[PDB]
Amino acid sequence: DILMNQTPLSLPVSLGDQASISCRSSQYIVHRNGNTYLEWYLQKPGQSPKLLIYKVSNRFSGVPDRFSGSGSGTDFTLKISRVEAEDLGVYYCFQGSHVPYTFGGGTKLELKRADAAPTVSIFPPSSEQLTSGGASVVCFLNNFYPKDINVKWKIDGSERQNGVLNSWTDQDSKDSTYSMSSTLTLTKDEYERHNSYTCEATHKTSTSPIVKSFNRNEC
Amino acid sequence: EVQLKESGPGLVQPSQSLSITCTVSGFSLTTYGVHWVRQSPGKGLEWLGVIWSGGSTDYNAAFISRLSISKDNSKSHVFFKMNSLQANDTAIYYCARMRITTDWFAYWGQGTLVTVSAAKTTPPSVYPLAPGSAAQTNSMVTLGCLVKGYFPEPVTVTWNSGSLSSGVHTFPAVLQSDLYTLSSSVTVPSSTWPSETVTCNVAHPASSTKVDKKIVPRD
């Protein structure tokens, strides 16, 4: 199959910046009929992808001038000249020359902002949940930038890897930050075998991790 | 005006088949091919196959053994059927006209979210998330609701009937066991809570569940 490699994975930008997205094919993508079926799609959250550029360089119906494509051989590029708010989303490249047709991995176009540390909050299991036999310890890591972040659970001094599930938000409409939850789920019985519970966040902003915790002795 | 309308199930049992109808308006199926594509967090966008104007087909060979695309030119319907679905076939499925040459009918259907699961409909538990007794105070205060063990998606969550629209992060659902779990955080003035009531409203229409859960401080 033809491999389609997009770069960068993620591209931060300010409203008014110019942007350049790359797509590289593992082979030549000229159809038997002579046409080069390299296409560029933009997708917003919760919407279907929409065609921007077809046959390498041609703009689709209602695509602004600021969008343009070029390329040949194994090398293709999409450039935006002055990014506007409506341009933010995930960009994909597609080849329809050689069956099976294939997509690139996507490039996310997101809005730049100043750095922010996560606001970390730890929550013990409710008494209601314990009655039901389960114990979910929840940690929120809210409003941080950039996206990259690491979360670590410790129980009575020891890192705990199993039982941890994480969920991430998209970039916030109002402030442009992200937010994450990390949830450690245990049985009631194992929850009550331990005393100290710690959620640890390590982020670009600090060389020290941010550590929130509680003790069951006090619960 | 050009529309590709998708219809079919959003839920398929493991080992069963997925059928989708794509009802096309705005161009002729006897002039233009219609493609089928899916999107999953494991594999991103994947092209599955195509039915050309004459009824000949091309399939992605990773699916050829269980995939069939046919059509009815007179009704303007394209039919997708995939057999023997497994958990990792959970994805958004699309019909679409893409890889265009001469025409401007490049449009995608609205997408059909297909979940492959043997799970039974199941209402959520709604656990309130309040700070541990110890300690812990500074402005603002972050609270939450844990909405655990439901099926299928979705649930909605608002706070104080939507009064606290701002300062809320409701995270994407993750699977634990065969059921869904998510949480919503809300951040509101330290002076307000608990002097001021904060209640999360959770809805799971599939089970006719509506639950308000007040966040009591713990002692």
Ligand SMILES: C=CCO[C@]1(C(=O)O)C[C@@H](O[C@]2(C(=O)O)C[C@@H](O)[C@@H](O)[C@@H]([C@H](O)CO[C@]3(C(=O)O)C[C@@H](O)[C@@H](O)[C@@H]([C@H](O)CO)O3)O2)[C@@H](O)[C@@H]([C@H](O)CO)O1
């Ligand atoms: C009845 C027509 C015979 O052609 C087909 C069929 O329609 O069933 C398709 C044909 O596939 C190929 C080919 O020429 O071998 C290759 C394939 O990759 C495509 O390029 C198709 C068509 O050319 C695509 O048609 C369209 C499109 O759907 O995008 C629409 C057309 O109106 C036109 O705009 C063209 C464009 O100008 C040229 O691409 O695009 O052609 C092949 O499967 C034969 C089969 O050999 C018959 O036994 O059937």
Ligand SMILES: *[C@@H]1O[C@H](CO)[C@@H](O)[C@H](O)[C@H]1NC(C)=O
């Ligand atoms: C998908 O799922 C099945 C699970 O039984 C597995 O056999 C197969 O390796 C998986 N392949 C892909 C491409 O997801």
Ligand SMILES: [K+]
């Ligand atoms: K025709």
